[PDB]
Write a protein that binds this ligand. Structure first.
Ligand SMILES: O=c1cc(-c2ccccc2)oc2cc(O)c(O)c(O)c12
Ligand SMILES: O=c1cc(-c2ccccc2)oc2cc(O)c(O)c(O)c12
Ligand SMILES: *Cc1c(COP(=O)(O)O)cnc(C)c1O
Ligand SMILES: *Cc1c(COP(=O)(O)O)cnc(C)c1O
Lengths: 810, 810
């Protein structure tokens, strides 16, 4: 149908049909009389997977012979979403499979909808990992993602009476045709036990063993025939485990719980033992696999020339003392040489400055669980602090601030400090965030080793985030500038020369229109709710947090509502306000915010005076595959975190790429995006970082805003007095109370500027031609935010490897 | 190579090679450079499985169109062993696969050794189920085996210091290429809850739900292109299960424990709640599948014309009240019509008279777990006892004896009584066992309903138990009488005309010789132990029990030893005594017997005066695949249970078929085997049933035997005084104590006759020609003990369906 989806060659189509029928018969053991749509999905998945395997085997063979430096991307999260369409897109099979399926009388698009998300992450950090794997394969890097094969990923969110309920996400129930179990490469991981000192050094003894079984998933590059591996470990008990009889067998569950479930906290540290076991399990099994591969080429001097380990946040920070343990305890290198190798191997990416996200493990946990690692940690600390003492003699406060060991009722290890001491590079994830690392929370470390600290602004894959989810937009762009921009997104810059082209303005706006009709329809089918597709689609989708200020958005929604009620007969630009995202299960406040949103929707959606001028929708179960649908359909992207709190964001980038305008604060990558498009092409408002700091220095007093802004006061009164909750008048008193007295995120301080700026958005939307021209300027300047750019910068400035666009042979 | 293994056609061999390489590449994702022997096994398994699927789909389609009466064989155990070779044999692919593998430079026989046993049973009862499935498919019956997919089958047995240690049997670790998950046919099973009575009848409410997910395994008939299904249920939690968050997810394990592990008791009842859950889980999920299939043809009158349910022991006895529950509570039939349908549907096979095997569930367990079933049970009981009252008026003792409810400190349900009341047929498993059911333990039931009680003597499949494990013997038989005997074992009778044929005597004896060399070699390789292959192979293999009298065998071994020590320079026929089998984990006595055997082996195998005249080997980890190796190699089969205790046996039949002579009591099927071969062709000794009864009537006093038999006294003194355990002199005092004071199985009463009869065996073994002639008479008369005969008798006299040897089209 559309060109970017590749060729439907006669031969190709015939082969796909025959392979489909082969899998349906031999793999699924069905005929056409009994097959369900699910059977059909699986037959297609197996047919497509068969095209990946030869390329997978050739790529892995290529790395064996050439022996390039290998990149190991360690993460507790890989938020992959669906694999089938992505695989078609990257192998250029999309149109052929469309044709083949059509001719067997099936709708490929219906079969696509049957695949479960691989929801092995919370939000930004795990989706980033997924984008990075795509980019590493597209750039020909010898890269491996390593993580945990959780049996249950992020919970499925159901809204019941306006409250979130969590259901287990049983994503393996029907099988995963993408993974290959590799039970032959099972490795032991040790826990508990104790340290004995011999003449022969320290020995870690009387440990409990858990086995780590790896599952490999192929990661295809974009049309280059490279297929890299994502390896996820599963926990299995040893066969002599516990070994009355029955209970010993049933107790195998305690060891296998390690890989059972993803912790569903986004940007929040919970100090539970099972989480620490997860962290150690992935690090220990991964390092042994790393060392094994290196030995198949005694001489550890070359180890950092052959290996890079990237730590995605501090979650795999134990890689540092684990690598020391192996080099010192098992390979018998002396301390200083081991440390040298460790530092040159490891690099740390920080993802947040929020203090509640920082991992600080109680010493007594590490003592019981990983006694040897604790000793290595104290030793790292001592040698590190001796270096601080020598550079800053007499500065006793600096020593206490920089210690890996924090004093207190409970002693704790600061995992961020350990990552910094034990890495040759530390990066933040957007320019302002990296600056903040240098000026505030890692200032002391920056003064000791300025050379360690770098920026690598985040990006997103234009494969998933444009060609896959927005084929119509991909197509009208390709019609003008060709197809090359897909692996070279800077080429979108060529579109600035079409900003005054009537046919292009028309086509951009038509795509948006088609995307909106398609989403409006999807809302009706799967969730029985009726929207005006001529309204402005005002979207905020992301995890529910106080720092993300879904609450600021609510205040605006209520403001529009109160303006309509006051002047019912005035014209207003119609809007559909869509907010979606999951709350962490024990995050009470986040759960109250979901409930407030549904309560506003209960009042606004049923008021006959409002008509179809304003609708408030809560998008249930927000996840990667819902993002693929709602983002192409958006007009306005809400990115309204208090300046200084969103390290980067990546949602902001998805929407820029897909033809939405942005209203946001100067936070995170919003700053770079505004600089790329021009500030006049962006809806910037609110305090800057400097403003937040000024306000904190004299004290934030929310009452001042309440006293001076009558629109704001009316909103608070409505909330307090039961307007949004007639059956429980005081239902929202925690929200009000927090806003008036305990708001770390300064919702009221940004309210006036926000509402004003929202009026400018409305004014521009009345003028379709100028809106679409500003959109074109956004899309045309989104090149920088390709994760292909990000990855090339990690490769050159951290890993010391050269990216390559060369295709391997077919 | 050998004819019975089928044709190696040029085309067939070429296709197998290409399919092998396809699976190695696409299914296993390996090339020849990285593949392990395990990879090679899997490639072959997938290649062979592909030949089963078309036949599987055609067979199941055939049953849909013809709609024959369907047989449902319900069992908590299916002891399948390995599948690959059996599948080749039944599809006539064996020689082609041999050729194909050879040409790719692989030894098929090495790859065969890599497959794990499917060890989903304890012993005789579960192997019987496996033989029956083979026979049902060979006879063209529309039959389904239903059971539980246990994650851990019977434990792997390791001998450590002469003691059994149990290790978990993780048989799915590497995947099972034979099964097909069928997650779309998942069904709910209910537990706990309570009964409400409406005007609308009783309703079972507030239950916990566990889901039953089915896995299907193909069962191929012998060269008839029929492939039947074995469906095993796995337990899964519902997604809203429990649904802090993490703990709720981890607690999913409590529901999934139902299918985790096989209870490793053979012929012993342990009244634990988890076992009752297993029993209900398989019955509830199976009945719903049965009813569903029946409805896809309101009218339950025809239900027994379309369905037979065979209960393999009382383990699925809850099928009876479950079927009542569904008919009465859900379909709203009146009681009497439901009962009529239930009785005509169900049939019960009893497998033992040992009282410790009888299942008697405490009322309080059923009350909590299955409150509605308990009410149906009391109602069944009441109506049943009213029928007894009317036939035997005034006989109040009969009422108490026949009750389904036993009185006592703890009230209990007698599951055997329930099976009898609720079945149109009850059978024992050998002629004497069925007679004993009529005369002793079910006498009262037999007087009420004589017509219910039948015999169906057990048999074994000559596919696994001859062609597969003993191809050389199969071949020299086929050379004389052709190949037809494989599905018509009565044709072995034709061999009596070769009893005086020198070439045939020579070939029978040569096969035995080859089998012994092959086993002698296998002992050396895999277990480092050195045997004389010119000795008599004296084998006792079976579960370790007191009733099976491994101890009587030990006494004989020690007797031979003491005779050699007394007259070292006398000639004796050399023997290798091999004893193997597992003990139930908490069966202390069974565990002491294993230890005694190893202790005798410690003394006998290291005595230089004995030389290679006597060896005592404990065969570790006895299981189906070890039986396939040791049985073809045996000369003498020990079947020496106290008369009246072994309901049938089936091991006895395997050895008869494979050219061993038998020494045994008149117990079980030994009686029918002796009657088939002629008593002069069998080594019969010991008390008959009548003798045991006479001895019980006046009191068994072991001291009398000790006082009168000096050989016996010396043995007891040696045991008592530490001869077999120098480091712990009193190690065997429980054994001695039991033998002298508390022996229910009368080991001493049979000792003298046993030793004498063992001398006759030795005398015949000195005369190779006459030994082999007696062997020929055994093999030639083993026809009756084909499970094809057994199954044809169940089909005609219980199920009311006609067996068929017609082949379905290819
Ligand atoms: O996920 C959570 C995130 C945050 C949070 C608060 C302020 C700023 C950043 C993150 O607080 C929490 C507090 C809790 O008691 C809890 O159970 C949680 O799961 C969270
Ligand atoms: O499996 C068992 C079999 C028998 C047995 C004893 C005499 C006749 C038949 C069977 O006794 C037992 C006693 C136990 O205490 C025990 O834990 C067991 O597992 C068993
Ligand atoms: C991109 C993405 C995120 C990150 O969104 P932010 O707005 O950067 O917080 C979270 N969840 C999903 C499903 C995503 O696709
Ligand atoms: C046949 C068989 C049995 C039954 O043997 P008996 O001598 O009848 O008790 C038990 N275990 C295995 C592995 C078998 O093959």
């Amino acid at each position: 149908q559309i060109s970017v989806r590749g060729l439907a060659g006669v031969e190709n189509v015939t082969e796909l049909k025959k392979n489909f029928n082969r899998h349906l018969h031999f793999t699924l053991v069905k005929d056409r009389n009994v097959a369900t749509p699910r059977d059909y999905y699986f037959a297609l998945a197996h047919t497509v997977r068969d095209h990946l395997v030869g390329r997978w085997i050739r790529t892995q063979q290529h790395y064996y012979e050439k022996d390039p430096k290998r990149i190991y991307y360690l993460s507790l999260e890989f938020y992959m979403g669906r694999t089938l369409q992505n695989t078609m897109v990257n192998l250029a099979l999309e149109n052929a499979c469309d044709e083949a399926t059509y001719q067997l009388g099936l709708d490929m698009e219906e079969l696509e909808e049957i695949e479960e998300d691989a929801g092995l992450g919370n939000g930004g950090l795990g989706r980033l990992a997924a984008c990075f794997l795509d980019s590493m394969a597209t750039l020909g890097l010898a890269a491996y993602g390593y993580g945990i094969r959780y049996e249950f990923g992020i919970f499925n969110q159901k809204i019941c009476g306006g409250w979130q309920m969590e259901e287990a996400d049983d994503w393996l129930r029907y099988g995963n045709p993408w993974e290959k179990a590799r039970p032959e490469f099972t490795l032991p991981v040790h826990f508990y036990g104790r340290v004995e000192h011999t003449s022969q050094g320290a020995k870690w003894v009387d440990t409990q063993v858990v086995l780590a079984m790896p599952y490999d998933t192929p990661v295809p590059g974009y049309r280059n025939n490279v297929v890299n591996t994502m390896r996820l470990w599963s926990a299995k008990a040893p066969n002599d485990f516990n070994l009355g009889y029955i209970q010993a067998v049933l107790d195998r569950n305690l060891a296998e719980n390690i890989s059972r479930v993803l912790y569903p906290n986004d940007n929040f540290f919970e100090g539970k033992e099972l989480r620490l076991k997860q962290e150690y399990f992935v690090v220990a099994a991964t390092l042994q696999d790393i060392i094994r591969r290196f030995k198949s080429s005694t001489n550890f001097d070359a180890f950092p020339d052959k290996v890079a380990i990237q730590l995605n946040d501090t979650h795999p920070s134990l890689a540092i003392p684990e690598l020391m343990r192996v080099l010192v305890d098992l390979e018998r290198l002396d301390w200083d040489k081991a440390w040298e190798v460790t530092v040159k191997t490891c690099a740390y990416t920080n993802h947040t400055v929020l203090p509640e996200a920082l991992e600080r493990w109680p010493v007594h946990l590490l003592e019981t669980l990983l006694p040897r690692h604790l000793q290595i940690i104290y030793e790292i600390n001592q040698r590190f602090l001796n270096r601080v003492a020598a550079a800053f003699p007499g500065d006793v406060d600096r020593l206490r601030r920089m210690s890996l060991v924090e004093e207190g009722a409970v002693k704790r290890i600061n995992m961020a400090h350990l990552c910094i001491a034990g890495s040759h590079a530390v990066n933040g994830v957007a320019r302002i965030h990296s600056e903040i690392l240098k000026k505030t929370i890692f200032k002391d470390f920056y003064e000791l080793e300025p050379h360690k600290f770098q920026n690598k602004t985040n990006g997103i894959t234009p494969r998933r985030w444009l060609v896959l989810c927005n084929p119509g937009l991909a197509e009208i762009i390709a019609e003008r500038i060709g197809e090359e921009y897909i692996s070279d997104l800077d080429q979108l810059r060529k579109l600035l020369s079409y900003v005054d082209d009537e046919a292009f303005i028309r086509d951009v706006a038509k795509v948006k229109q088609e995307n909106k009709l398609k989403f409006a329809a999807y809302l009706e089918r799967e969730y029985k709710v009726h929207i005006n597709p001529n309204s402005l689609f005002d979207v905020q989708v992301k995890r529910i947090h106080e720092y993300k200020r879904q609450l600021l958005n609510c205040l605006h929604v209520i403001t529009l509502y109160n303006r309509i009620k006051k002047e019912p007969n005035k014209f207003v630009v119609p809007r559909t306000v869509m907010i979606g995202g999951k709350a962490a299960p024990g995050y009470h406040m986040a759960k109250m915010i979901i409930k407030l949103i549904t309560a506003i929707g209960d009042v606004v959606n049923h008021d006959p005076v409002v008509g179809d001028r304003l609708r408030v929708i809560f998008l249930e179960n927000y996840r990667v595959s819902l993002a693929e649908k709602v983002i192409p359909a958006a007009d306005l992207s809400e990115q309204i975190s208090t300046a200084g709190t969103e390290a980067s964001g990546t949602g902001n980038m998805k929407f820029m790429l897909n033809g939405a305008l942005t209203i946001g604060t100067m936070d995170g990558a919003n700053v770079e995006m505004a600089e790329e498009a021009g500030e006049e092409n962006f809806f910037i408002f609110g305090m800057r970082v400097e403003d937040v700091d000024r306000l904190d220095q004299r004290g934030y007093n929310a009452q001042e805003y309440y006293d001076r802004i009558p629109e704001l006061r009316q909103i608070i009164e409505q909330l307090s007095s039961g307007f949004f909750s007639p059956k429980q008048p005081d239902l929202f008193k925690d929200i009000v109370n927090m806003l008036m007295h305990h708001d770390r995120f300064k919702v009221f301080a940004d309210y006036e500027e926000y509402v004003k700026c929202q009026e400018r958005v409305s004014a521009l939307y009345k003028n379709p031609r100028e809106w679409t021209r500003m959109v074109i300027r956004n899309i045309a300047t989104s090149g920088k935010f390709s994760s292909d750019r990000t990855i090339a910068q990690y490769a050159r400035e951290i890993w010391g490897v050269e990216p390559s666009r060369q295709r391997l042979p077919a």
